[PDB]
């Protein structure tokens, strides 16, 4: 999915909130909140069509609350 999204953006079609949410649906279960947070930071400080929605916030929150170690109450 990441390779295809990179190729699609290379072809001239930029990723929107839909593709980013699709990517986040898998990153949120990796056990490392930093991957999902990097994707969220990419979305939040980007263009209008990449802006996060409720699903994006839910994915990042789920990634943070189900972390393997360290505390994440401040991040949430």
């Amino acid at each position: 999915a990441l390779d295809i999204s990179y190729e699609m953006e290379a072809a001239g079609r930029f990723a929107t909130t839909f593709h980013f949410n699709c990517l986040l649906s898998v990153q949120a279960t990796c056990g490392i909140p930093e991957v999902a947070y990097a994707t969220f930071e990419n979305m939040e400080y980007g263009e209008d069509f990449m802006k996060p929605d409720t699903e994006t916030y839910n994915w990042v929150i789920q990634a943070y609350t189900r972390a393997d170690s360290y505390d994440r109450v401040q991040d949430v």
């Binding site: 999204s5 990723a15 991957v35 990097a38 980007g46």
Partner: peptide
């Protein structure tokens, strides 16, 4: 633009 993520 999707950032070239690097998690090190």
């Amino acid at each position: 633009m999707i950032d070239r993520y690097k998690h090190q």
